[PDB]
Design a protein around this ligand. Sequence first.
Ligand code: RAV
Ligand code: RAV
Lengths: 168, 168, 168, 168
Amino acid sequence: SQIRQNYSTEVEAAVNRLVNLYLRASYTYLSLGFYFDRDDVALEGVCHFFRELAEEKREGAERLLKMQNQRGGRALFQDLQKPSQDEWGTTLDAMKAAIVLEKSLNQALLDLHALGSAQADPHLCDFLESHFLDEEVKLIKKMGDHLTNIQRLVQAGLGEYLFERLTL
Amino acid sequence: SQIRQNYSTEVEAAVNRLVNLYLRASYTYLSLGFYFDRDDVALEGVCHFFRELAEEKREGAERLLKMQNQRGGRALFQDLQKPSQDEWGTTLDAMKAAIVLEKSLNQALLDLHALGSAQADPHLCDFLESHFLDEEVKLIKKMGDHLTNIQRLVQAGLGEYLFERLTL
Amino acid sequence: SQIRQNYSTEVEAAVNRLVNLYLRASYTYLSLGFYFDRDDVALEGVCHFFRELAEEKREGAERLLKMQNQRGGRALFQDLQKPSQDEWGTTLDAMKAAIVLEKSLNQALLDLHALGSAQADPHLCDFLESHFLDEEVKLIKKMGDHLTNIQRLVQAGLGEYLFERLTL
Amino acid sequence: SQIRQNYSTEVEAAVNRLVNLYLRASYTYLSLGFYFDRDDVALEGVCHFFRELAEEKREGAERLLKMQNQRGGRALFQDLQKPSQDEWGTTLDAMKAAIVLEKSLNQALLDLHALGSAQADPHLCDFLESHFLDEEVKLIKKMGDHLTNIQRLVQAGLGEYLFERLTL
Ligand SMILES: CCC[C@@H](C)C1(CC)C(=O)NC(=O)NC1=O
Ligand SMILES: CCC[C@@H](C)C1(CC)C(=O)NC(=O)NC1=O
């Protein structure tokens, strides 16, 4: 590539893997969202919370794809594995799965940052710090807050309704 | 009729029967609405929900009557049978009866559509599709959502109050 | 399902397959878009054209998912197969692949419509007609127009630049 | 210096060298710009593109000078070597020289960042990341895009005119 400079093949490959992780996270949130839209689940606040996250993850993937091209790397796409569940249980179950998902995305970001630092690639490191690392920390804090409130509310039916009505 | 074209006597008669069904549904919702306005029931959100449906059903009947005349059919009215109950029990009971009512209206629409298709009457089929079929599907989805939330809330008194306050 | 009415298992399954097709089409357009954003391809108008289609296909999938739930069907997601190519060649090559993709989506819509008609499911038939069938016809006409103009422009480098600058 | 803290003599000297590189880049772009303003070259879009870059590089030098003073380092200026060419050939030739220039500035930034990291100087590292590193990556991507389009357009006279008219 005419523009490629200080951009290792290792980082390029890792960025492609991170794109896959973000697209798969987006897919997972799409499924979560429409599950809460079921007539026999019917928690619109929860549906909206996850649909919004689906959009955020898709946007993250696209930001990574843009950066790949900016650096002269080449996007390679793989199959997107279907989400791990077809039915997501309670808001509590769903929020727990969401935090597990985000911690896995965060660890991937941290791993990529460590790789970038090993490869002496400050642009990559800065890119991750300004657009992904703090966003993950904030989102995980928020999910933790939600989990704590959901748990304190478990008359579980009553609690699940109130949380959706008054928090989401 | 000078204007009548491709409008079968079967469809004309069926449209008159559907008008009766819609007027009777409207009457049912009128009764539901004022029941929840009783000082010993006192659920204003529920009253409003049903009063609004009474207006929607009356409007549906009038749209059918307009179409009857547009096609050169002749409106024939029959007695409107009084609603099936004088007292409607809980919000849960009432919402269950409402969904039963709407499924019966929907089936009547589907039957009329099948008749129109058998009579090769595309105007009728289109009329039902654009003004009634999707509205029924949407309303039934909403009622199902409400039923699910009411059920999850059953401290039944507390649940009935919260649903009326926070959903309706 | 409490709300499900006149919604066959065949249609429910077919709607799930159509969701997969739309998500995969979206994925294909994502890849097409970022390919034209490569520094060694550099056709921004073409990139934007495909990115916009990626969004349209994702939106189509979500509309189908909403309808699935409205009817009381259950969303089931499968793996999303990666796009058929990693590199998309010329604008001409890409536009040809796009029209092949859209014709395949259109045929799937037509097949689902035929199924709905066989199952006497007028809501499904109307849903497809008002939100998908005409949109496909319009998009395919536009792609055909583009293909014709690209072909008339093939000094192929010059033609590809002018088309991107003056049409897209 | 009363304010100097964690600011190595090595970094101070390197920052002075980077100032020289940026001022020289600015000078190079000044020459490029006025070359395309010649009556026998006459490509106003190209002239403007380079004049704007001259201003950007001068602004970069001044930002570095400000930071030098903020940290308590002392600005030292050296002779500015004249640009490497008096006449810049085609837009293609000029854009190639511009990308060579920017890669050399980028490498200097990367070298300074590595030095800052070795000296454990996080303020320097952050300063470079937020104001220079991403700007270089973006500019180099843009130049690569331009080069690709210019090359696809080479009727070379025709191509050079069209690129200036429709891109710049
Ligand atoms: C918001 C959900 C994202 C979905 C639609 C998904 C992958 C499934 C995505 O993340 N990005 C796309 O460009 N297309 C898609 O289909
Ligand atoms: C925009 C061109 C910059 C020129 C004018 C140059 C060095 C030649 C500069 O970069 N900064 C200045 O302060 N003066 C100058 O003359």
